[PDB]
Amino acid sequence: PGREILVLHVGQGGNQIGYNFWKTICEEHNIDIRSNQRKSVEEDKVDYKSVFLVEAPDGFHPRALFIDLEPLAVEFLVKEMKLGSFFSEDLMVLSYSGAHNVWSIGYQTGKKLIPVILEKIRDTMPETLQGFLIIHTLGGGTGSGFGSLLTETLKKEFPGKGVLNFSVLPSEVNDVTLAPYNTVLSLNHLSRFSDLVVLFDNTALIRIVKDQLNYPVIKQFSDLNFLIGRVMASITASLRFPGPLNMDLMEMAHNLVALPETKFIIPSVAPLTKEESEMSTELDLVERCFDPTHYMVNCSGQGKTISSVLMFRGNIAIENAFSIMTDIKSNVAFAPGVHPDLGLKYGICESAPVDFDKEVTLLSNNTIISEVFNRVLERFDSLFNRDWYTSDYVNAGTSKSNLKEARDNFDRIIKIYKEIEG
Numbered sequence: 080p081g082r083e084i085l086v087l088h089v090g091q092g093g094n095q096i097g098y099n100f101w102k103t104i105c106e107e108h109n110i111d112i113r114s115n116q117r118k119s120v121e122e123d124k125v126d127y128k129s130v131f132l133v134e135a136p137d138g139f140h141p142r143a144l145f146i147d148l149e150p151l152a153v154e155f156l157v158k159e160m161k162l163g164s165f166f167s168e169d170l171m172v173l174s175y176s177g178a179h180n181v182w183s184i185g186y187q188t189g190k191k192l193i194p195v196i197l198e199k200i201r202d203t204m205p206e207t208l209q210g211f212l213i214i215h216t217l218g219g220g221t222g223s224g225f226g227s228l229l230t231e232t233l234k235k236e237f238p239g240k241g242v243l244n245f246s247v248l249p250s251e252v253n254d255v256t257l258a259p260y261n262t263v264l265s266l267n268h269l270s271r272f273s274d275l276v277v278l279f280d281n282t283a284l285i286r287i288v289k290d291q292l293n294y295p296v297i298k299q300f301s302d303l304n305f306l307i308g309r310v311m312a313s314i315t316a317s318l319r320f321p322g323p324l325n326m327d328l329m330e331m332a333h334n335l336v337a338l339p340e341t342k343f344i345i346p347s348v349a350p351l352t353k354e355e356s357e358m359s360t361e362l363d364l365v366e367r368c369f370d371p372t373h374y375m376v377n378c379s380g381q382g383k384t385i386s387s388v389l390m391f392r393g394n395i396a397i398e399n400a401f402s403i404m405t406d407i408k409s410n411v412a413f414a415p416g417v418h419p420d421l422g423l424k425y426g427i428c429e430s431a432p433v434d435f436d437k438e439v440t441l442l443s444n445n446t447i448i449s450e451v452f453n454r455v456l457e458r459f460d461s462l463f464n465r466d467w468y469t470s471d472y473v474n475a476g477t478s479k480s481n482l483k484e485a486r487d488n489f490d491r492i493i494k495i496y497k498e499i500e501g
Protein backbone atom coordinates (compact mmCIF):
# COMPACT_ATOMS: atom_id res chain seq x y z
CA PRO A 80 0.00 0.00 0.00
CA GLY A 81 0.98 3.61 -0.61
CA ARG A 82 0.76 6.59 -2.95
CA GLU A 83 -2.99 6.95 -2.25
CA ILE A 84 -4.59 10.36 -2.91
CA LEU A 85 -7.86 11.80 -1.57
CA VAL A 86 -9.71 14.38 -3.68
CA LEU A 87 -11.91 17.12 -2.13
CA HIS A 88 -14.39 18.83 -4.47
CA VAL A 89 -15.62 22.19 -3.10
CA GLY A 90 -18.55 24.33 -4.32
CA GLN A 91 -20.43 24.26 -7.63
CA GLY A 92 -17.44 24.40 -9.94
CA GLY A 93 -15.29 22.05 -7.87
CA ASN A 94 -17.94 19.30 -7.84
CA GLN A 95 -18.92 19.74 -11.50
CA ILE A 96 -15.23 19.34 -12.41
CA GLY A 97 -15.26 16.21 -10.26
CA TYR A 98 -17.69 14.54 -12.63
CA ASN A 99 -15.28 14.89 -15.54
CA PHE A 100 -12.23 13.89 -13.47
CA TRP A 101 -13.81 10.74 -12.10
CA LYS A 102 -15.29 9.78 -15.48
CA THR A 103 -11.76 10.03 -16.94
CA ILE A 104 -10.14 8.04 -14.11
CA CYS A 105 -12.71 5.24 -14.40
CA GLU A 106 -12.28 5.10 -18.19
CA GLU A 107 -8.48 4.90 -17.91
CA HIS A 108 -8.78 1.95 -15.52
CA ASN A 109 -11.51 0.08 -17.51
CA ILE A 110 -14.03 0.67 -14.65
CA ASP A 111 -17.72 1.20 -15.40
CA ILE A 112 -18.62 4.29 -13.34
CA ARG A 113 -22.30 3.15 -13.28
CA SER A 114 -21.81 -0.44 -12.12
CA ASN A 115 -18.68 0.23 -9.99
CA GLN A 116 -17.17 -2.88 -11.67
CA ARG A 117 -14.37 -3.64 -14.09
CA LYS A 118 -15.78 -3.72 -17.60
CA SER A 119 -13.95 -7.04 -18.22
CA VAL A 120 -11.16 -9.21 -16.89
CA GLU A 121 -9.52 -9.49 -20.32
CA GLU A 122 -9.09 -5.73 -20.81
CA ASP A 123 -8.05 -5.13 -17.22
CA LYS A 124 -4.59 -3.64 -17.62
CA VAL A 125 -1.56 -3.87 -15.36
CA ASP A 126 -2.09 -0.76 -13.27
CA TYR A 127 -2.31 0.69 -9.77
CA LYS A 128 -5.97 1.49 -9.23
CA SER A 129 -5.59 2.43 -5.58
CA VAL A 130 -4.12 5.89 -6.31
CA PHE A 131 -7.64 7.27 -6.71
CA LEU A 132 -9.97 4.26 -6.38
CA VAL A 133 -11.00 2.27 -3.32
CA GLU A 134 -11.68 -1.39 -4.09
CA ALA A 135 -14.37 -2.88 -1.88
CA PRO A 136 -15.89 -6.36 -2.26
CA ASP A 137 -18.86 -4.78 -4.07
CA GLY A 138 -16.81 -2.70 -6.51
CA PHE A 139 -14.77 0.48 -6.88
CA HIS A 140 -15.44 3.84 -5.24
CA PRO A 141 -13.77 7.25 -5.56
CA ARG A 142 -11.48 8.32 -2.77
CA ALA A 143 -13.24 11.66 -2.74
CA LEU A 144 -15.45 13.99 -0.71
CA PHE A 145 -18.16 16.10 -2.39
CA ILE A 146 -18.46 19.30 -0.36
CA ASP A 147 -20.76 22.29 -0.76
CA LEU A 148 -22.72 24.74 1.36
CA GLU A 149 -25.82 24.40 -0.85
CA PRO A 150 -27.15 21.07 -2.18
CA LEU A 151 -28.40 21.80 -5.72
CA ALA A 152 -25.23 21.73 -7.86
CA VAL A 153 -24.20 18.33 -6.48
CA GLU A 154 -27.67 16.81 -6.31
CA PHE A 155 -28.58 17.89 -9.86
CA LEU A 156 -25.21 16.69 -11.16
CA VAL A 157 -25.59 13.25 -9.58
CA LYS A 158 -29.11 12.85 -10.97
CA GLU A 159 -28.26 14.04 -14.48
CA MET A 160 -25.08 12.00 -14.83
CA LYS A 161 -26.58 8.93 -13.10
CA LEU A 162 -23.76 8.88 -10.54
CA GLY A 163 -25.80 7.76 -7.52
CA SER A 164 -23.77 4.62 -6.80
CA PHE A 165 -20.37 6.27 -7.39
CA PHE A 166 -20.83 9.74 -5.88
CA SER A 167 -22.52 8.04 -2.99
CA GLU A 168 -24.28 9.73 -0.07
CA ASP A 169 -21.58 8.78 2.47
CA LEU A 170 -19.09 10.85 0.44
CA MET A 171 -21.18 14.03 0.51
CA VAL A 172 -20.81 16.85 3.02
CA LEU A 173 -23.60 19.27 2.09
CA SER A 174 -25.31 22.11 3.94
CA TYR A 175 -28.33 24.21 2.92
CA SER A 176 -27.64 27.98 3.13
CA GLY A 177 -24.96 28.89 0.50
CA ALA A 178 -22.00 31.28 0.73
CA HIS A 179 -23.69 33.93 -1.48
CA ASN A 180 -20.39 34.52 -3.33
CA VAL A 181 -18.59 35.87 -0.23
CA TRP A 182 -15.30 34.15 0.67
CA SER A 183 -15.77 35.05 4.34
CA ILE A 184 -19.18 33.35 4.53
CA GLY A 185 -17.70 30.26 2.88
CA TYR A 186 -14.82 30.27 5.37
CA GLN A 187 -16.90 30.87 8.52
CA THR A 188 -19.77 28.56 7.59
CA GLY A 189 -17.37 25.84 6.48
CA LYS A 190 -15.91 25.66 9.99
CA LYS A 191 -19.10 24.00 11.20
CA LEU A 192 -18.50 21.09 8.82
CA ILE A 193 -14.75 20.59 9.47
CA PRO A 194 -15.34 18.02 12.28
CA VAL A 195 -17.42 15.79 9.97
CA ILE A 196 -14.89 16.14 7.16
CA LEU A 197 -11.94 15.20 9.37
CA GLU A 198 -13.86 12.23 10.75
CA LYS A 199 -14.70 10.98 7.25
CA ILE A 200 -11.07 11.42 6.20
CA ARG A 201 -9.69 9.64 9.24
CA ASP A 202 -12.31 6.87 8.87
CA THR A 203 -11.19 5.74 5.41
CA MET A 204 -7.75 7.20 4.63
CA PRO A 205 -4.86 4.71 4.54
CA GLU A 206 -1.87 5.70 6.63
CA THR A 207 0.33 5.70 3.54
CA LEU A 208 -1.83 8.39 1.93
CA GLN A 209 0.50 10.67 0.01
CA GLY A 210 -1.72 13.75 0.02
CA PHE A 211 -4.85 15.64 -0.99
CA LEU A 212 -6.11 17.40 -4.12
CA ILE A 213 -8.58 20.25 -3.56
CA ILE A 214 -10.69 21.15 -6.63
CA HIS A 215 -12.44 24.52 -6.49
CA THR A 216 -13.17 27.82 -8.15
CA LEU A 217 -11.79 30.99 -6.66
CA GLY A 218 -14.39 33.53 -7.78
CA GLY A 219 -17.43 32.22 -5.87
CA GLY A 220 -17.77 31.97 -2.11
CA THR A 221 -17.73 28.26 -1.17
CA GLY A 222 -14.96 26.94 -3.40
CA SER A 223 -12.98 30.05 -2.55
CA GLY A 224 -13.62 30.41 1.19
CA PHE A 225 -14.37 26.85 2.25
CA GLY A 226 -11.67 25.68 -0.19
CA SER A 227 -9.19 28.02 1.49
CA LEU A 228 -10.27 26.77 4.92
CA LEU A 229 -9.80 23.16 3.80
CA THR A 230 -6.31 23.90 2.46
CA GLU A 231 -5.34 25.41 5.83
CA THR A 232 -7.01 22.61 7.79
CA LEU A 233 -5.42 19.71 5.95
CA LYS A 234 -1.96 21.23 6.00
CA LYS A 235 -2.29 21.75 9.76
CA GLU A 236 -3.98 18.41 10.56
CA PHE A 237 -1.82 16.20 8.28
CA PRO A 238 1.74 17.48 8.23
CA GLY A 239 3.94 15.49 5.92
CA LYS A 240 1.16 14.89 3.38
CA GLY A 241 0.92 16.92 0.19
CA VAL A 242 -1.82 19.50 -0.27
CA LEU A 243 -2.27 20.43 -3.95
CA ASN A 244 -4.90 22.82 -5.29
CA PHE A 245 -6.54 22.77 -8.72
CA SER A 246 -8.02 26.24 -8.81
CA VAL A 247 -10.18 28.09 -11.34
CA LEU A 248 -9.44 31.81 -11.72
CA PRO A 249 -12.09 34.28 -12.90
CA SER A 250 -12.62 34.89 -16.62
CA GLU A 251 -11.16 37.93 -18.39
CA VAL A 252 -14.40 39.75 -17.65
CA ASN A 253 -15.40 38.33 -14.27
CA ASP A 254 -18.83 36.70 -14.07
CA VAL A 255 -18.96 37.39 -10.30
CA THR A 256 -18.45 41.05 -9.45
CA LEU A 257 -17.10 40.02 -6.01
CA ALA A 258 -14.52 37.69 -7.61
CA PRO A 259 -11.49 40.00 -7.02
CA TYR A 260 -12.07 39.87 -3.26
CA ASN A 261 -12.65 36.12 -3.27
CA THR A 262 -9.65 35.47 -5.53
CA VAL A 263 -7.22 37.61 -3.52
CA LEU A 264 -8.36 36.05 -0.24
CA SER A 265 -8.03 32.52 -1.71
CA LEU A 266 -4.64 33.06 -3.32
CA ASN A 267 -3.34 34.61 -0.09
CA HIS A 268 -4.52 31.54 1.82
CA LEU A 269 -3.13 29.08 -0.72
CA SER A 270 0.19 30.92 -0.74
CA ARG A 271 0.36 30.26 2.99
CA PHE A 272 -0.88 26.67 3.10
CA SER A 273 -0.80 24.94 -0.30
CA ASP A 274 2.18 23.01 -1.60
CA LEU A 275 1.36 23.68 -5.26
CA VAL A 276 -1.46 25.54 -6.99
CA VAL A 277 -2.39 24.53 -10.54
CA LEU A 278 -4.47 27.31 -12.14
CA PHE A 279 -7.10 27.45 -14.90
CA ASP A 280 -9.51 30.05 -16.20
CA ASN A 281 -12.61 29.81 -18.33
CA THR A 282 -11.47 32.33 -20.94
CA ALA A 283 -8.53 30.07 -21.82
CA LEU A 284 -10.63 26.90 -21.54
CA ILE A 285 -13.35 28.22 -23.86
CA ARG A 286 -10.71 29.35 -26.34
CA ILE A 287 -9.15 25.87 -26.37
CA VAL A 288 -12.50 24.10 -26.84
CA LYS A 289 -13.62 26.35 -29.66
CA ASP A 290 -10.22 26.64 -31.41
CA GLN A 291 -8.56 23.25 -30.82
CA LEU A 292 -11.52 20.88 -30.44
CA ASN A 293 -13.80 22.97 -32.69
CA TYR A 294 -16.88 22.09 -30.65
CA PRO A 295 -19.90 23.72 -32.34
CA VAL A 296 -21.39 24.73 -28.98
CA ILE A 297 -20.72 24.46 -25.25
CA LYS A 298 -24.09 23.69 -23.64
CA GLN A 299 -22.88 22.33 -20.27
CA PHE A 300 -19.75 22.80 -18.18
CA SER A 301 -18.92 19.15 -18.85
CA ASP A 302 -17.85 20.33 -22.33
CA LEU A 303 -15.25 22.58 -20.60
CA ASN A 304 -14.28 20.77 -17.40
CA PHE A 305 -12.98 17.76 -19.32
CA LEU A 306 -9.79 19.76 -19.92
CA ILE A 307 -9.18 20.12 -16.18
CA GLY A 308 -9.85 16.41 -15.70
CA ARG A 309 -7.36 15.60 -18.48
CA VAL A 310 -4.60 17.55 -16.71
CA MET A 311 -5.38 15.93 -13.37
CA ALA A 312 -5.41 12.46 -14.89
CA SER A 313 -2.33 12.83 -17.10
CA ILE A 314 -0.03 14.30 -14.50
CA THR A 315 -0.82 11.37 -12.21
CA ALA A 316 -0.64 8.69 -14.92
CA SER A 317 2.83 7.45 -13.98
CA LEU A 318 1.49 6.67 -10.47
CA ARG A 319 -1.21 4.49 -12.04
CA PHE A 320 0.32 2.76 -15.10
CA PRO A 321 3.71 1.30 -16.10
CA GLY A 322 6.36 3.45 -17.65
CA PRO A 323 10.07 4.19 -17.94
CA LEU A 324 10.17 7.26 -15.68
CA ASN A 325 7.60 7.78 -12.93
CA MET A 326 7.01 10.75 -10.64
CA ASP A 327 4.78 11.49 -7.65
CA LEU A 328 3.07 14.66 -6.41
CA MET A 329 5.80 16.14 -4.25
CA GLU A 330 8.45 15.06 -6.75
CA MET A 331 6.77 17.35 -9.26
CA ALA A 332 6.32 20.14 -6.71
CA HIS A 333 9.97 19.95 -5.64
CA ASN A 334 11.14 20.33 -9.25
CA LEU A 335 8.81 23.30 -9.84
CA VAL A 336 9.09 25.41 -6.67
CA ALA A 337 12.34 27.32 -7.08
CA LEU A 338 11.63 29.72 -4.19
CA PRO A 339 9.07 28.91 -1.48
CA GLU A 340 6.62 31.50 -2.82
CA THR A 341 6.75 30.43 -6.49
CA LYS A 342 4.12 27.68 -6.31
CA PHE A 343 1.54 28.94 -8.86
CA ILE A 344 1.50 26.77 -11.99
CA ILE A 345 0.01 27.11 -15.50
CA PRO A 346 -0.93 23.81 -17.15
CA SER A 347 -1.32 22.86 -20.80
CA VAL A 348 -1.91 19.67 -22.80
CA ALA A 349 -1.36 18.60 -26.40
CA PRO A 350 -2.88 17.37 -28.60
CA LEU A 351 -6.57 17.94 -27.89
CA THR A 352 -7.93 15.36 -30.40
CA LYS A 353 -7.29 11.73 -31.34
CA GLU A 354 -6.71 12.68 -35.00
CA GLU A 355 -3.95 15.11 -34.01
CA SER A 356 -2.37 12.50 -31.71
CA GLU A 357 -1.83 10.24 -34.72
CA MET A 358 -0.27 13.03 -36.87
CA SER A 359 2.21 14.80 -34.55
CA THR A 360 5.74 14.41 -33.19
CA GLU A 361 7.06 14.71 -29.64
CA LEU A 362 8.64 18.02 -30.64
CA ASP A 363 5.40 19.33 -32.15
CA LEU A 364 3.41 18.42 -29.02
CA VAL A 365 5.91 20.04 -26.64
CA GLU A 366 5.98 23.22 -28.74
CA ARG A 367 2.18 23.33 -28.60
CA CYS A 368 2.26 22.98 -24.80
CA PHE A 369 4.63 25.92 -24.57
CA ASP A 370 2.44 28.01 -26.86
CA PRO A 371 -0.06 30.42 -25.24
CA THR A 372 -2.86 29.01 -27.47
CA HIS A 373 -2.65 25.86 -25.33
CA TYR A 374 -2.18 27.51 -21.90
CA MET A 375 -5.20 26.91 -19.67
CA VAL A 376 -4.67 30.34 -18.06
CA ASN A 377 -5.36 33.33 -20.31
CA CYS A 378 -1.92 34.93 -20.93
CA SER A 379 -0.67 37.70 -23.22
CA GLY A 380 2.37 35.74 -24.35
CA GLN A 381 4.84 32.98 -23.60
CA GLY A 382 6.33 34.73 -20.53
CA LYS A 383 9.52 33.29 -19.05
CA THR A 384 9.59 29.74 -17.74
CA ILE A 385 11.27 29.24 -14.38
CA SER A 386 10.78 25.47 -14.24
CA SER A 387 8.57 22.93 -15.97
CA VAL A 388 7.35 19.37 -15.67
CA LEU A 389 6.49 17.47 -18.85
CA MET A 390 4.57 14.19 -18.73
CA PHE A 391 4.91 12.11 -21.91
CA ARG A 392 2.12 9.53 -22.22
CA GLY A 393 1.71 6.72 -24.68
CA ASN A 394 3.60 5.85 -27.85
CA ILE A 395 6.66 7.99 -27.02
CA ALA A 396 10.04 7.68 -28.72
CA ILE A 397 12.38 8.17 -25.76
CA GLU A 398 15.22 9.34 -28.00
CA ASN A 399 12.96 12.10 -29.31
CA ALA A 400 11.91 13.08 -25.78
CA PHE A 401 15.56 13.60 -24.81
CA SER A 402 16.95 14.90 -28.08
CA ILE A 403 14.43 17.75 -28.32
CA MET A 404 15.53 19.16 -24.96
CA THR A 405 18.13 21.50 -26.49
CA ASP A 406 15.45 22.69 -28.93
CA ILE A 407 13.00 23.38 -26.09
CA LYS A 408 15.66 25.28 -24.18
CA SER A 409 16.55 27.29 -27.31
CA ASN A 410 13.08 28.00 -28.69
CA VAL A 411 11.18 28.68 -25.42
CA ALA A 412 11.99 31.69 -23.24
CA PHE A 413 13.25 30.78 -19.77
CA ALA A 414 13.89 33.13 -16.86
CA PRO A 415 17.38 34.76 -16.90
CA GLY A 416 18.76 32.69 -14.06
CA VAL A 417 17.83 29.28 -15.57
CA HIS A 418 20.95 27.45 -16.72
CA PRO A 419 20.80 26.19 -20.36
CA ASP A 420 20.81 22.58 -19.04
CA LEU A 421 18.08 23.05 -16.41
CA GLY A 422 14.38 23.77 -15.98
CA LEU A 423 12.89 20.47 -17.28
CA LYS A 424 11.53 17.56 -15.28
CA TYR A 425 10.35 14.48 -17.21
CA GLY A 426 7.87 11.72 -16.56
CA ILE A 427 7.26 9.04 -19.18
CA CYS A 428 4.24 6.73 -18.96
CA GLU A 429 3.33 4.00 -21.42
CA SER A 430 -0.42 4.53 -21.00
CA ALA A 431 -2.02 6.85 -23.60
CA PRO A 432 -5.20 8.75 -22.72
CA VAL A 433 -8.43 7.32 -24.13
CA ASP A 434 -7.96 6.37 -27.82
CA PHE A 435 -4.99 8.75 -28.29
CA ASP A 436 -1.65 7.61 -29.68
CA LYS A 437 0.38 9.90 -27.40
CA GLU A 438 -0.06 13.05 -25.31
CA VAL A 439 2.12 15.64 -23.56
CA THR A 440 1.06 17.55 -20.43
CA LEU A 441 3.02 20.58 -19.27
CA LEU A 442 3.08 22.19 -15.82
CA SER A 443 4.88 25.51 -16.07
CA ASN A 444 6.11 27.76 -13.30
CA ASN A 445 6.14 30.93 -15.38
CA THR A 446 6.83 34.59 -14.57
CA ILE A 447 3.74 35.57 -16.60
CA ILE A 448 1.75 34.66 -13.48
CA SER A 449 2.71 38.17 -12.36
CA GLU A 450 0.66 39.62 -15.24
CA VAL A 451 -2.30 37.37 -14.46
CA PHE A 452 -2.16 38.21 -10.76
CA ASN A 453 -1.61 41.94 -11.41
CA ARG A 454 -4.87 42.06 -13.35
CA VAL A 455 -6.64 40.48 -10.35
CA LEU A 456 -5.00 43.04 -8.10
CA GLU A 457 -6.09 45.91 -10.35
CA ARG A 458 -9.68 44.63 -10.14
CA PHE A 459 -9.36 44.29 -6.36
CA ASP A 460 -8.11 47.87 -6.00
CA SER A 461 -10.95 49.27 -8.14
CA LEU A 462 -13.44 47.92 -5.59
CA PHE A 463 -11.49 48.28 -2.36
CA ASN A 464 -10.42 51.88 -2.97
CA ARG A 465 -14.14 52.80 -3.21
CA ASP A 466 -15.19 50.58 -0.26
CA TRP A 467 -17.52 48.76 -2.64
CA TYR A 468 -19.02 45.39 -1.63
CA THR A 469 -17.06 45.15 1.64
CA SER A 470 -20.02 45.00 4.09
CA ASP A 471 -20.70 41.28 3.94
CA TYR A 472 -17.00 40.43 4.24
CA VAL A 473 -16.83 42.57 7.38
CA ASN A 474 -20.04 41.04 8.74
CA ALA A 475 -18.53 37.54 8.35
CA GLY A 476 -15.21 38.18 10.11
CA THR A 477 -12.93 39.64 7.39
CA SER A 478 -12.29 43.23 8.36
CA LYS A 479 -11.35 45.92 5.86
CA SER A 480 -7.88 45.77 7.42
CA ASN A 481 -7.84 41.99 6.80
CA LEU A 482 -8.79 42.48 3.14
CA LYS A 483 -5.90 44.94 2.82
CA GLU A 484 -3.46 42.54 4.52
CA ALA A 485 -4.42 39.79 2.07
CA ARG A 486 -4.00 42.17 -0.87
CA ASP A 487 -0.57 43.29 0.30
CA ASN A 488 0.71 39.74 0.74
CA PHE A 489 -0.65 38.91 -2.72
CA ASP A 490 1.31 41.85 -4.12
CA ARG A 491 4.46 40.54 -2.45
CA ILE A 492 4.10 37.23 -4.34
CA ILE A 493 3.56 39.13 -7.59
CA LYS A 494 6.75 41.08 -7.02
CA ILE A 495 8.74 37.88 -6.39
CA TYR A 496 7.69 36.54 -9.80
CA LYS A 497 8.40 39.87 -11.47
CA GLU A 498 11.87 40.04 -9.93
CA ILE A 499 12.72 36.56 -11.24
CA GLU A 500 11.58 37.74 -14.66
CA GLY A 501 14.44 40.24 -14.54
Ligand SMILES: Nc1nc2c(ncn2[C@@H]2O[C@H](COP(=O)(O)OP(=O)(O)OP(=O)(O)O)[C@@H](O)[C@H]2O)c(=O)[nH]1
Nearest residue numbers: 090091092095178179180216218219220221222300
Ligand atom coordinates in the same frame (compact mmCIF):
# COMPACT_ATOMS: atom_id res chain seq x y z
N1 LIG B 1 -14.58 25.87 -15.26
C1 LIG B 1 -15.67 25.86 -14.48
N2 LIG B 1 -16.06 27.02 -13.85
C2 LIG B 1 -17.16 27.02 -13.06
C3 LIG B 1 -17.92 25.88 -12.88
N3 LIG B 1 -18.96 26.20 -12.05
C4 LIG B 1 -18.84 27.50 -11.70
N4 LIG B 1 -17.75 28.03 -12.35
C5 LIG B 1 -17.18 29.37 -12.23
O1 LIG B 1 -16.93 29.51 -10.84
C6 LIG B 1 -17.17 30.85 -10.43
C7 LIG B 1 -18.34 30.88 -9.45
O2 LIG B 1 -18.07 29.91 -8.47
P1 LIG B 1 -19.07 28.73 -8.03
O3 LIG B 1 -18.32 27.44 -8.06
O4 LIG B 1 -20.35 28.76 -8.84
O5 LIG B 1 -19.36 29.19 -6.53
P2 LIG B 1 -19.37 28.29 -5.22
O6 LIG B 1 -18.01 27.78 -4.88
O7 LIG B 1 -20.40 27.19 -5.32
O8 LIG B 1 -19.71 29.39 -4.11
P3 LIG B 1 -21.16 30.02 -3.77
O9 LIG B 1 -22.16 29.73 -4.87
O10 LIG B 1 -20.94 31.49 -3.60
O11 LIG B 1 -21.54 29.45 -2.43
C8 LIG B 1 -17.59 31.63 -11.65
O12 LIG B 1 -16.45 32.32 -12.15
C9 LIG B 1 -18.11 30.52 -12.54
O13 LIG B 1 -18.10 30.84 -13.91
C10 LIG B 1 -17.54 24.71 -13.53
O14 LIG B 1 -18.19 23.68 -13.39
N5 LIG B 1 -16.41 24.71 -14.32
Ligand code: NA
Nearest residue numbers: 090091149221
Ligand atom coordinates in the same frame (compact mmCIF):
# COMPACT_ATOMS: atom_id res chain seq x y z
NA1 NA C 1 -22.73 27.48 -5.35
Ligand code: NA
Nearest residue numbers: 091179180219
Ligand atom coordinates in the same frame (compact mmCIF):
# COMPACT_ATOMS: atom_id res chain seq x y z
NA1 NA D 1 -23.64 30.32 -6.88
